Amino acid sequence: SNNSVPGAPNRVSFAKLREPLEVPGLLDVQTDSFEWLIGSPRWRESAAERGDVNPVGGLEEVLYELSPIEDFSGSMSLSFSDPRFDDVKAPVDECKDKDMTYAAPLFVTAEFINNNTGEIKSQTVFMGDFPMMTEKGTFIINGTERVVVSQLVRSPGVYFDETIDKSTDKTLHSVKVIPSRGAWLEFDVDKRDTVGVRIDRKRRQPVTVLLKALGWTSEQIVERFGFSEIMRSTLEKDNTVGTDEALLDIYRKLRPGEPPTKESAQTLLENLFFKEKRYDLARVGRYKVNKKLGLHVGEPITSSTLTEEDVVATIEYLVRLHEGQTTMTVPGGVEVPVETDDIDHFGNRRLRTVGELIQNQIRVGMSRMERVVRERMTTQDVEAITPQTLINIRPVVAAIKEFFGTSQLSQFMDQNNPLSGLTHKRRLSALGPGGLSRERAGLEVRDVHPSHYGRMCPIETPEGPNIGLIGSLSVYARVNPFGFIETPYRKVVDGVVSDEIVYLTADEEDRHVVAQANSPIDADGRFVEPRVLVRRKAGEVEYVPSSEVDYMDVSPRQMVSVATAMIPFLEHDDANRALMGANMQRQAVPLVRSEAPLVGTGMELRAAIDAGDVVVAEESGVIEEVSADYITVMHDNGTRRTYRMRKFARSNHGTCANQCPIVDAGDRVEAGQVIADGPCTDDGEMALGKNLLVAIMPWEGHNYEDAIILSNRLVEEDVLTSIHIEEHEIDARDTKLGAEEITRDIPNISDEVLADLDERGIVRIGAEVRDGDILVGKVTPKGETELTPEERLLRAIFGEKAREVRDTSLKVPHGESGKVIGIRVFSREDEDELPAGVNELVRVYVAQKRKISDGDKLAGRHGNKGVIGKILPVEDMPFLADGTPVDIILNTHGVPRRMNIGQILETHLGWCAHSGWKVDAAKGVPDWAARLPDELLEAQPNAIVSTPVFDGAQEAELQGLLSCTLPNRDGDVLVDADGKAMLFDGRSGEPFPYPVTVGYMYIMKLHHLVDDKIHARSTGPYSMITQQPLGGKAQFGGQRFGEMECWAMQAYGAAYTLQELLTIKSDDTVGRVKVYEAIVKGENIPEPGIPESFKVLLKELQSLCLNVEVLSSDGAAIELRE
C-alpha cells in the first residue's frame, strides 16, 4: 500500500493517512551541490524545470569572473572559458584497492589576444585531475573514503542592532555592513543624537562627511532628510562644506602621513567602496540587501558591490528606525517593514555546502596562478609567447590537493554501520576554518532558536563539549540556490487544504501564519473546530479562527533528524534521554546475522535504501546465475549485467563490511528492488540489534546501578558475536648503508619461531597468531661503516649482497590475536606507485570473531545504556510458567528517575507483536478499536508492526491489544491484562510472590568492548630518551600517576609508598634492575636510589652557570657523580 520500494516486507502501521509527498532523496544535500559545481546536464535541466534562467555552474562562474587578464599597458589580453570533463580513469573498487584517488581530467579552452597585432590564439589546456564524488556522496583520496560536511556561516549583509543607554536610557540603533570581501563600513548613533560613520574600524566622523564626499549639496541633503531634525542637528556640527574638503579629510583620516591631492582621494575611495577589484559582496549579499531595502525586486543579478543608492537607503532606514517609524518605502521602491535584525535568526545563517567550499579553494588557486601569469606576462617578449608558457597549473592542483588533505572539513567517513555514514553526510558544523573557534562560542549560539522548526533538528547533538555547535539537517529540508534552507508547506486558501506543496525560507515563514499538521481535518478538506492552534512570529503560539490560516505543515515528523526518526514512542521520552538514545544508534556494531526489529518507525527502510550500502537492481530482469560472489541478471531487452559484492573488507573503524544475496535464480525482479543486503541489514531494512526477552526486576544485586544480567544462551547461540579486522603495515626503505629486504633468515632465531612463514618471508594465510609472533621478517644493515659509492656501485652492477643485518621484523602487538585472512604486497619494481624512498610495502589483515562477556556495553533505543555484569547459566535465569527462561534482566530503580518511560510502552507492544493478537469483532468493533486501521485487527505470531513518531499507537489501543493476545502451543496465556506475568525463581525453586513485567525489546551492542581496554604490565620496554616506561597499550606501557594521586597519597601520611612509586618504579636506572633481581631471588628490597629527573635538573642548572651542590647534615660537601 503506502510502500513505494518494490518487494519490501509489509509492515502494518498505526497512522492517519498522510501522503502529500514521500521523503526526498536523503543524500541530495551532498549530491546536487557538486552537480552544480561541475555543471552536469542534470543540474542544468533541473534548474530549467525550477524556472530559473541562465544556467551557470561554479567553474563557469569563477572562470567568467577571472576573465579577462591584461597587463598595465593593455596591449595583450587573455581569457578562459568553457570547461569540460572526461571519463573517469578507473572504477571505485580498484581505486580503493590500488590506493589511487578517484579523479577525472579537466580541460579548458584558452585564448590569448593582442590588440596591437590584432591576433588571437586558442587551444585546449589540461588543468589537472579533479576529484569526483562517487554515487554515494563520498570522495576517495589515496584509498580512504573521505566526506566533506556542510558549514554554517553568518550571511553577508546589513544588520541593524539596537542598544539601550545605561544612563540616558535611550534607544540607540547601530548598523553594520559585513561584506563577503573588502573593508568594513558602518554607521553609528550616540546619545548625543549624532550620526557618524566608521570605515575599516577607524574613529568616528559624521556621515555628513560621506554625504559631502558624494558631491551632494546642502539643499539636496535637506530635501532628502527634511522629515527628520536629528539629521539636521547632526549636519549642523559639520566642520566645512565642499566636496574637496570631504575627500581630503577622508584621505587624511584613513591614511595619515600621505600626500593630499584633489584627484587622488576620489580614486581610492571609489576603489575601496564601488570597484569590483578590491571590495565585493556576493550574490547572496545583493539579494539580501535588495530584499531588505526593496529596491528593484525584479532586477536580475548584475553587480556585486555597493551603490550610492544603497548608502542613502540605509541612512534613511537608520534615521527612521531611530525615531520609531513603522513602515518605510525608499523612493521608487516598495513598502517593507522596519525592525531590528536578529543575529542568529535562521534567515541570516547561511549553509555553505561542499560546492561553495571547493569553489572557494579553486578561486584561491587561480588567484595565485593569475599573479604568476601577470608577473611573467611582461617579462617575456610579445612575439615569442604562447599561453602554454603563461599558465602554470601548480597552484591550482596544490590547493585542491591540500584542502582535502588537511582542512578541518574533510573528515574520514564513520563506517560503524550504514546509519553512521548517512548521518555523517548530512551533518551541519558551525566550527571550521573561517568560522568561530570553540572558545569564541557563547551561550547565545548554542541553544535552539524558534526558527529551527523544520530546518535543524533540535534533539540530535553530540553530548560532549561540542554541544550545540554541531547539528543535523531535518528530514524534509532542502537547500535553496543561495545557501538558505527551505522547508515544505501545504497551501491553505480559506479553510480548504490543497495538495500543492510550496517551499518556504525563514523570512516567508516569519511573515505568514502556519498551523500544526496534527490538527483535525475533515475528509472533504475543511477544518472542523473553529479555533485551531497556530504558530506565529517570535515563537508565539495561540488559538485562531480557521478563516485566516495561511499554511499547514506536511507531516508530524517534520522537525526531527533521520537518526531520531527511528526511535519508537519518541514523544514519551524526555529530551535529555532522547539525545542519548539518538546518539547511540550511531555507535552500534554489526553482528554476524542480523534481525529486523519487531517495532520500528518505518523510516529505517528509506534510511537503508538511501545509505547506499545495499545493492539495488538498476533495471528490471530475471536472475540467471546467483553465487556468493556475484549476481548476474539479464534485462528485458536481452542485455546482461553482473553485480560484484564485497566480502570481508575492512571498514574504517575495524568492523566487517559483508554483503549477501537475498534473491534466488529464476526470480523476477523489478528496477529499484533490493537484491543484496549489506551490513546491518536484513531484507532491506536497517537492523542493528536483536530481539531479547526482557524482565524488569532487581535481582540479588548483580544489576545494581545500571548493570545488565545476560543469559548464557546468548553466548551459546552466538546471538551477539561480531567480527573485527585489524590491519598491520610494514615497509622497507632504502637506507644509506644499503637496502632493507624482506627475508626469511632472521639473525639467530630458532626455527620453531620461524615455522609459519613461507620462503618469501610472509606468514602463510590462515595461521593463527598471538602476541610476540613474527608476521613479516625484515633486516636492516648494521652501522659498522658507511659504504662508499664505489663499492656499492660495483656490487650493484653484478647485483651482489653482503652479510650485515639486524632484525626489525613486524610482530603482533600486545593484545591482538586471530587468523590472517589477506595479504597485500606492493613493490616499486612492479610498476606500482609508491611513496618515495620505499621499495616494498606489506599489509596483513588479522580477523577475530569476538563474543559477548563482562565489561561489554549494551543499550536499548531509548538511551538506557548499561554494562554487562554477570552471564548466568541458562538454568539460573527466572523462567515463565511455560518454561522459557528470560534472556536478560533489567533494573527498575532507573526508570522513574530518568523519565524514559517510553521503553516500558515499547516493551509491552513487543509482546503484543511477538505472540500475535486477534481482537474480537462480535457485536461490532469495540470503542477503542474505532480509529484503529483494519490492517491491525488480526496478526500472525512475530509479525512486525510500525509506529511513527508523534503519531501511532495510543495508550487505549495498546491496553486493548494486551487483553486480546493469542495463547501459546499449550493453550495458555503467559501474561496478564496489566502486562505482567508470574515468573518462577530458577535459583531456588519457589515462585516469586508478585507478578513481574516481561516483554520483548530491541537491544544493540555498543562499540566499547572490554578486550581492547584490559591491559597489564610488570616490566617491559623503556623509553630511550626519558628512561620512563612507554605509553599507550600497543606499546606495552604503564599507567599515568597524576598529581591528584600524589596529593591523595600524601593525605594518608603514606611516605614509603609515594617515594617508591616515584623512584624505583619509574626512572631509577640502577634501582629497577636491583629490585627485579631481589624479588626474583627472594631477598629484601634494597633502598631506593636517586631519580634521573633530579640529575637532569642539576645538569640543566649547572649549564646556566649556577653552582648547585648537595650538602650533608653537618656541612661536609657531597657529590652525586657516582
Number of residues that bind other proteins (CB under 8 A): 99
Residues 893-932 that bind other proteins (CB under 8 A): none
Give whichever of 204 and 1013 is closer to other proteins, judged by the CB atom.
Answer: 1013
Nearer to other proteins by Cβ, of 345 and 824: the residue is 824
Identity at 1032, one-letter amino acid code: G
Q: How far apart are CA 812 and CA 125, in angstroms?
A: 51
| For other proteins, the closer CB: 394 or 1013 | 1013
Is residue 869 close enough to count as binding other proteins by CB under 8 A? yes
Q: How far is CA 813 from CA 346, 820, 1033, in A?
A: 51, 14, 9
Whose Cβ is closer to other proteins: residue 241's or residue 1090's?
A: 1090
**Nearest C-alpha neighbor of 97 from the set 156, 144, 62, 50:** 144
Binders of other proteins among 360-419, rule CB under 8 A? none
Report the residue from 120, 241, 301, 1046 that binds other proteins according to the rule CB under 8 A.
1046
Beta bridge partners of 150: 428
CB of 793 to other proteins, least distance (A): 16
Contact pick of 167, 547, 637, 1018 for other proteins (by CB under 8 A): 1018
Chain residues 660-719 in contact with other proteins, contact rule CB under 8 A: 660-661, 664, 700-702, 704-705, 707, 716, 718
Q: Among the candidate windows 117-125, 282-290, 578-586, 657-665, which touches other proteins by CB under 8 A?
A: 657-665
Beta strands in 681-763 (DSSP E): 681-682, 685-686, 690-696, 707-711, 723-733, 741-742
For 523, phi then psi, to 5°, come to: -65, -25
Cell output for 253: 583620516
The set of long-range contacts for 331-339, using a CB threshold of 8 Å and a minimum separation of 24, is 332/295, 333/293, 333/294, 333/295, 333/296, 334/294, 334/297, 335/294, 336/292, 336/293, 336/294, 339/160
Choosing from 287, 879, 928, 950, the residue that interacts with other proteins (CB under 8 A) is: 879
For other proteins, the closer of residues 335 and 1122 by Cβ is: 1122
User: Nine-digit cell at 1066?
Assistant: 619509574
Residue with cell 662508499: 788
The one-letter code for the residue type at 242 is: G
State in angstroms the smallest separation of the CB of 699 from other proteins: 10
Question: Is residue 1074 a contact point for other proteins (CB under 8 A)?
Answer: no
CB-based contacts of 300: which residues, under 8 Å, 6+ apart? none
Looking at 1017, 1049, 1058, 1074, which residue binds other proteins (CB under 8 A)?
1017
* 544 sits near other proteins (criterion: CB under 8 A): no
Find the DSSP H helices in 778-844.
789-797
Furthest-apart CA pair in the chain: how many Å?
A: 111
1050 near other proteins, rule: CB under 8 A: no
The one among 1026, 1034, 1054, 1057 contacting other proteins by CB under 8 A: 1026
Q: How far is the CB of 1076 from other proteins (least distance, A)?
A: 10
Q: Which is nearer to other proteins, 922 or 1025 (CB)?
A: 1025
Residue 512, CA atoms < 13 Å, CB-side half-sphere? 19
**Binding region for other proteins (CB under 8 A) out of 33-41, 470-478, 877-885, 937-945:** 877-885
Chain-centroid distance of CA 901 in Å reads 30
From CA 927, how far away is CA 833, in angstroms rounded? 74
Which residue of 297, 1016, 1051, 1080 would you call a contact of other proteins, by CB under 8 A? 1016
* Residues 621-650 interacting with other proteins (rule: CB under 8 A): 626-629, 647-648
Question: Which of residues 571 and 629 has its CB atom nearest to other proteins in the complex?
Answer: 629
Contact with other proteins (CB under 8 A): which of 216, 973, 1028, 1058? 1028
1093 binds other proteins (CB under 8 A): yes
- Kindly tell me the burial class for residue 487, based on how many C-beta atoms sit within 10 Å of its own C-beta (0-12, 13-18, 19 or more): buried
729 sits near other proteins (criterion: CB under 8 A): no
The residue within the footprint of other proteins, chosen from 283, 376, 824, 1065 (CB under 8 A), is 1065
Nearer to other proteins, 563 or 880 (CB): 880
Residue closer to other proteins by CB (options 18, 814) is 814
Asked whether position 1019 contacts other proteins by CB under 8 A, the answer is yes
Q: Tell the smallest beta-carbon distance from residue 1016 to other proteins (Å).
A: 4
Among 500, 605, 607, smallest CA distance to 3 is for 605
Interaction residues for other proteins, span 581-600 (CB under 8 A): 592-593
Is the Cβ of residue 242 or residue 783 nearer to other proteins in the bound state? 783
Burial of 944 (0-12, 13-18, 19+ CB in 10 A): middle
Question: ∠ CA(640), CA(642), CA(648), 5° rounding?
Answer: 175
Q: Which is nearer to other proteins, 15 or 737 (CB)?
A: 737
Q: Which of 1039, 1050, 1073, 1086 binds other proteins (CB under 8 A)?
A: 1039
Binding segment (CB under 8 A) for other proteins, from list 105-113, 269-277, 742-750, 1010-1018? 1010-1018
Closest to other proteins by CB, 274 vs 1041, is 1041
Measured CA to CA, the distance from residue 535 to residue 510 in angstroms comes to 10
Query: Does 575 contact other proteins by CB under 8 A?
Result: no
Task: Work out whether 753 is an interface residue with other proteins (CB under 8 A).
Answer: no
Burial 1009-1032 (b: 16+ CB within 10 A, else e): beeeeeeeeeeeebeeeebebbee
Instruction: Return the HEC string of 523-579.
Output: CCCEECCCEEEEECHHHCEEEEECCCCCEECCCHHHHCCCHHHHCCCHHHCCHHHHH
**Applying CB under 8 A, does 531 fall inside the site for other proteins?**
no
Residue 674: Cβ-neighbour burial (10 angstroms; 0-12, 13-18, 19+):
buried
Residue 484: CB minimum distance to other proteins, A = 41
Residues in the chain preceding a C-to-N separation beyond 2.5 angstroms (breaks): none
Q: Which among 354-362, 499-507, 518-526, 1066-1074 is the span making contact with other proteins, rule CB under 8 A?
A: 1066-1074
Question: Should residue 882 be labelled a site residue for other proteins when binding is judged by CB under 8 A?
Answer: yes
User: How far is residue 8's CA from residue 206's CA, in Å, rounded to a whole number?
Assistant: 71
In this structure, what C-alpha cell is assigned to residue 971? 493453550
39 binding other proteins? (CB under 8 A): no
CB-based burial of residue 520 (10 Å sphere; 0-12 exposed, 13-18 middle, 19+ buried)?
Answer: exposed
Q: Site mask, other proteins, residues 840-859, x = CB under 8 A?
A: -------x-x----xx----
Residue range at the interface with other proteins (CB under 8 A); choices 300-308, 554-562, 597-605, 1062-1070: 1062-1070
- Rounded to whole angstroms, how far apart are CA atoms 355 and 587? 29
Residue found under cell 579553486: 362
Q: Which is nearer to other proteins, 153 or 825 (CB)?
A: 825
Q: Is the CB of 283 or the CB of 1017 nearer to other proteins?
A: 1017
**For residues 608-642, b (16+ Cβ closer than 10 Å) or e, as one string?**
bbbbbbbbbbeeebebeebeeeebebeeeeeeeee
Q: Using the rule CB under 8 A, is 1077 a contact of other proteins? A: no
Q: Interface with other proteins includes 255 (CB under 8 A)?
A: no
- Interface with other proteins, residue 1085, by CB under 8 A: no
Whose Cβ is closer to other proteins: residue 463's or residue 768's?
768
Least Cβ distance, residue 972 to other proteins (angstroms): 11
Q: Which range of residues in 345-353, 397-405, 473-481, 1083-1091 is near other proteins by CB under 8 A?
A: 1083-1091
Among residues 899 and 1070, whose Cβ is nearest to other proteins? 1070
967 scored as a contact of other proteins (CB under 8 A): no
What part of residues 760-819 is at the interface with other proteins (CB under 8 A)?
764-768, 783, 786, 819
